[PDB]
């Protein structure tokens, strides 16, 4: 998302402008994104545990 | 601002396309001095005081010759550039209207002060060289002393007489002989004076113009030695080198104190 | 192009302008929260007026103080913003002149040279030592400098356009120290102005309302007996302030550093010491040609008191003149911009091709 060139420098040509930024984009720590990252962390990390449980019974057959 | 601009343009030897070349040459030479360095130390050897004295005094002779060759080359470069600066200005070298002759006198005065400026620079190059190499020697001593690539810098022998134990060379021999070496360094650095007092400058700075004499400021102005005496920090570094000497001999004294226990039976059996 | 790391107030102008087109405060901001709180955070960088306006979301330092470039990245940020916003240009079209404090360690000197050359497109460039070109603004080649109010407080004797490196020393007081003492004496008086807003208001007060007593013991007894010498000021909140002995007690700290608790000889005696370090032949020229600089000198009365105090120290044979440029809080910038104006100076620069083999060595050398 970050890497969008700031519109000014392409849109206006008839003078030097430089030091052009990117657009702003939503960063990596806006809370709603952070809590989605948490939720998906929970989802994967916990789902991995039943694989442990199944492996546990297989470990006797091991 | 334009008035001081004009006064600067009048002043700027640093920008005038003739004194500027002369400066650039002398400055380059000062650079070569600052990199040439001074004292030498061997990282994998352990000097006797006699060895260190001989090697350092030889090093002093080498750099003395280097500095003399350098100074006399600079002397030629300066005189020849000054003669250019006169001949291009409509002034005839003194070895070769009245207000125009006064303009010659003024031009020689500025050339004089420009030379003296070059001398001040060279002198400070020598000052920094000397103090920095003294710091390097202090760092060598202290970094090896911490082991009281790490070979110790100096060698000593312990003498057992029937009466007493002593080290050769003693703390007295280290203190006085290394003071001797230090003072050889100091006077060799001090030895070669600034250029200003040389006959070339005496003549051109005192130019005989319209067949009338002129005069100038002189070598006892520029005084490197004054600031050598003023540098409290160099003197302190020398004192701290002497403290490293003293602490190392204190460690030797402790070891000799252990040896005095063996001297007890030595004296017993020699009296038997 | 002209660039100044002015550590009380930084400044920029094209070379040979009459004034620095841009003047800006010696700060760069970082977001104080580590995450971007809101789209205002398009950069993590807020140079100059950006920090001054936006302090509360920003991390706040004078990046340099005293004798050195401290924090190379943040200075490079300041210089980048100086070129692109403040000079409003890509500089490489024209040579650039830059400032450094006196006796800046040669390691910093080359490190800076490298940083400027590699980071910024440039034809040819030089960094200059604030005292030397500050003296050029005096017009003398041969003079001692004082500066206070834009940096730590230097003494610098200069002969025929160059210093005596033997004779460079600081007095470790800067503009803040004046604000610190003034805050002390205001809190004694009871104003207790110390908050960051109060801090700025007190810096305004000290800049405009300071004056230096001609004979402090006499002026202080006069004002304390005769409160007609103590003068009224209106606060932004409509309070009236009265300022009196404080007007000259604050500059007096320069003469009596023990007033701010500093165990040092005063500016006069440390100047006299510096002079004595040099050749007596130069010393007479320094007594003939003293130059004082920086925001602290801008005050009324400072140059007269200094003239008297140096006359008291100076041998009776010495002629004494403090030279007090009305602009002297810009002295370096004036001298630099004037020098850089000269096309004959253009030969003095260092440029890409010689910069490769010569440049590390040749700039270090030409920087003296």
The DSSP string of C47-88 is ETHHHHHHGGGEE---S--TTS---HHHHHHHHHHIIIIIS-
- B111: tokens are 């050339």
Closest to B83 in 3D by CA, of B196, B207, B198: B207
Closest to C162 in 3D by CA, of B30, B173, B206: B30
Experimentally, how was this structure solved? cryo-EM
- Do chain A and B touch: 3 or more Cβ pairs under 8 angstroms? no
How far is the C-alpha of B63 from the C-alpha of B60, rounded, in Å?
5
DSSP C278: S
Say if the Cβ atoms of C35 and A27 lie within 8 Å.
yes
How far is the C-alpha of C80 from the C-alpha of C59, rounded, in Å?
19
Is residue C185 classed exposed, middle or buried when 0-12, 13-18 and 19+ CB atoms within 10 A define those classes?
middle
Collapse the DSSP code of C121 into the 3-class scheme (helix H, G, I; strand E, B; otherwise coil) and give the result: coil
Longest dimension (CA), chain B: 104
Q: Are C306 and C275 in contact (CB under 8 A)?
A: no
How far is the C-alpha of C172 from the C-alpha of C180, rounded, in Å?
14
Say if the Cβ atoms of C166 and B223 lie within 8 Å.
no
Say if the Cβ atoms of C41 and A19 lie within 8 Å.
no
Flag whether residue C43 sits within 8 Å of chain A, measured between CB atoms: yes
How far is the C-alpha of A45 from the C-alpha of B1, rounded, in Å?
74
Closest residue on chain C to B228 (Cα) = C166
Say if the Cβ atoms of C84 and A30 lie within 8 Å.
no
Report chain A residues whose CB lies below 8 A from the CB of C34. 29
Residue C5, min C-alpha distance to chain A (Å)? 21
Report chain C residues whose CB lies below 8 A from the CB of B12. 161, 344
- Cα–chain-centroid distance for residue B104? 36
How far is the C-alpha of B105 from the C-alpha of B109, rounded, in Å?
6
Q: Entry resolution in angstroms?
A: 4.7
Closest residue on chain A to C37 (Cα) = A30
Collapse the DSSP code of C310 into the 3-class scheme (helix H, G, I; strand E, B; otherwise coil) and give the result: helix
Report chain C residues whose CB lies below 8 A from the CB of B124. 164-166
How far is the C-alpha of C292 from the C-alpha of C256, rounded, in Å?
18
Residue C346, min C-alpha distance to chain B (Å)? 9
How far is the C-alpha of B1 from the C-alpha of B19, rounded, in Å?
25
Say if the Cβ atoms of C162 and B121 lie within 8 Å.
yes
Q: Which residues in chain C (85-144) have CB-CB distances under 8 A to chain A?
A: 85, 89-90
Closest to B28 in 3D by CA, of B118, B135, B100, B99: B118
Q: Which chains pack against A, by 3+ Cβ pairs within 8 A? A: C
Collapse the DSSP code of C2 into the 3-class scheme (helix H, G, I; strand E, B; otherwise coil) and give the result: strand
Closest residue on chain B to C339 (Cα) = B5
Report chain A residues whose CB lies below 8 A from the CB of C84. 18-19
CA angle C209, C210, C212 (to 5 degrees): 145
DSSP string, C124-179: EEEEEEHHHHHHHHHT-SSEEEEE-SSSSEEEEEEETTEE-GGG-EEE---HHHHH
- C249: tokens are 């007690």
Residue C137, min C-alpha distance to chain B (Å)? 7
Secondary structure element (H or E) that encloses residue C30, with its range = strand C28-31
Say if the Cβ atoms of C161 and B117 lie within 8 Å.
yes
How far is the C-alpha of C135 from the C-alpha of C231, rounded, in Å?
35
DSSP C195: S
């Amino acid at each position: 998302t970050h890497a969008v060139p700031q519109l000014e420098k392409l849109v206006m040509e008839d003078i030097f402008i430089s030091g052009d930024p990117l657009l702003e984009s939503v960063g990596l720590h806006e809370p709603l994104v952070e809590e989605l990252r948490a939720n998906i962390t929970n989802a994967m990390h916990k789902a991995m545990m039943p694989l442990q449980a199944y492996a546990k019974e297989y470990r006797k057959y091991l | 601002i334009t008035g001081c601009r004009k006064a600067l343009r009048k002043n700027l030897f640093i920008v005038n396309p003739y004194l500027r070349p002369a400066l650039l040459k002398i400055n380059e030479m000062c650079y070569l001095l600052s990199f040439m360095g001074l004292c030498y130390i061997e990282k994998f050897h352990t000097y006797t005081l006699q060895e260190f004295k001989a090697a350092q005094i030889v090093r002093l002779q080498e750099v003395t010759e280097r500095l003399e060759v350098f100074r006399c080359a600079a002397k030629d470069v300066v005189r020849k550039s000054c003669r250019f600066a006169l001949r291009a200005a409509g002034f005839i070298p003194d070895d070769c209207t009245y207000t125009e002759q006064a303009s010659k006198r003024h031009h020689c005065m500025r050339l004089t002060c420009f030379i003296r400026l070059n001398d001040y620079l060279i002198q400070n190059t020598l000052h920094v060289l000397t103090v920095n190499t003294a710091s390097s020697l202090l760092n060598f001593f202290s970094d090896k002393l911490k082991r009281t690539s790490l070979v110790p810098m100096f060698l000593t022998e312990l003498i057992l007489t029937v009466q007493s134990l002593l080290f050769e060379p003693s703390l007295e021999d280290f203190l006085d002989g290394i003071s001797g070496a230090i003072n050889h360094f100091e006077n060799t650095v001090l030895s070669v004076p600034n250029l200003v007092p040389d006959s070339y400058f005496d003549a051109f700075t005192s130019p005989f113009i319209n067949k009338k004499v002129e005069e100038k400021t002189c070598g006892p102005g520029p005084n490197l030695s004054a600031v050598f005496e003023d540098d409290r920090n160099f003197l302190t570094i020398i004192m701290q080198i002497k403290e490293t000497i003293h602490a190392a001999f204190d460690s030797a004294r402790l070891y000799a104190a252990t040896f005095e226990k063996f001297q007890l039976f030595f004296k017993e059996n020699e009296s038997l | 192009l002209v660039c100044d790391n002015g550590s009380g107030l930084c400044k920029a102008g094209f070379a040979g302008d009459d004034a620095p087109r841009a003047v800006f405060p010696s700060i760069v901001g970082r977001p104080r929260h580590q995450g971007v709180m809101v789209g205002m955070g398009q950069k993590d960088s807020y140079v100059g007026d950006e920090a001054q306006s936006k302090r509360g979301i920003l991390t706040l330092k004078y990046p340099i103080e005293h004798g050195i470039i401290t924090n190379w990245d943040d200075m490079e940020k300041i210089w980048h913003h100086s070129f692109y916003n403040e000079l409003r240009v890509a500089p490489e079209e024209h040579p650039t002149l830059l400032t450094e404090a006196p006796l800046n360690p040669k390691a910093n000197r080359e490190k800076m040279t490298q940083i400027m050359f590699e980071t910024f497109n440039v034809p040819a460039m030089y960094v200059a030592i604030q005292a030397v070109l500050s003296l050029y603004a005096s017009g003398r080649t041969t003079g001692i400098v004082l500066d206070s109010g834009d940096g730590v407080t230097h003494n610098v004797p200069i002969y025929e356009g160059y210093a005596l490196p033997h004779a460079i020393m600081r007095l470790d007081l800067a503009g803040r120290d004046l604000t610190d003492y003034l805050m002390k004496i205001l809190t004694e008086r009871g104003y207790s102005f110390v908050t960051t807003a109060e801090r700025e208001i007190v810096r305004d007060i000290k800049e405009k309302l300071c004056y230096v007593a001609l004979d402090f013991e006499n002026e202080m007894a006069t004002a304390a007996s005769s409160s007609s010498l103590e003068k009224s000021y209106e606060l932004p909140d409509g309070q009236v302030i009265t300022i009196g002995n404080e007007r000259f007690r604050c500059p007096e700290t320069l003469f009596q550093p023990s007033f701010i608790g500093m165990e040092s000889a005063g500016i006069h005696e440390t100047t006299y010491n510096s002079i004595m370090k040099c050749d007596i032949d130069i010393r007479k020229d320094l007594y003939a040609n003293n130059v004082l600089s920086g925001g602290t000198t801008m005050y009324p009365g400072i140059a007269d008191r200094m003239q008297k105090e140096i006359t008291a120290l100076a041998p009776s044979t010495m002629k004494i003149k403090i030279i007090a440029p009305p602009e002297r809080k810009y002295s370096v910038w004036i001298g630099g911009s004037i020098l850089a104006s000269l096309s004959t100076f253009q030969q003095m620069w260092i440029s890409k091709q010689e910069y490769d083999e010569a440049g590390p060595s040749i700039v270090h050398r030409k920087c003296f």
